[PDB]
Structure 1
């Protein structure tokens, strides 16, 4: 549960939760990045 939130029976407040993640080029199962110069 990446960057998840959970609560029960709770009162809130201003800016109670803030997340500032960066996921450029992320969460890659089998995607390769390669080159093959035989020349």
Structure 2
């Protein structure tokens, strides 16, 4: 694919552009995410 971004990308808490691929018999767990201002 093709991806183009021009400007600002803001993320307080989390993941950006994560790529999990080609897994067999795989397991995982992600936790919570908080944003306070």
Answer yes or no: same fold by TM over 0.5: no
- TM-score normalised by length of structure 2: 0.30
> Normalising to structure 1: TM-score of the pair?
0.30
Higher relative contact order (CA 8 A, sep 6+): 2
Query: Could you say which structure has the larger radius of gyration?
Result: 1
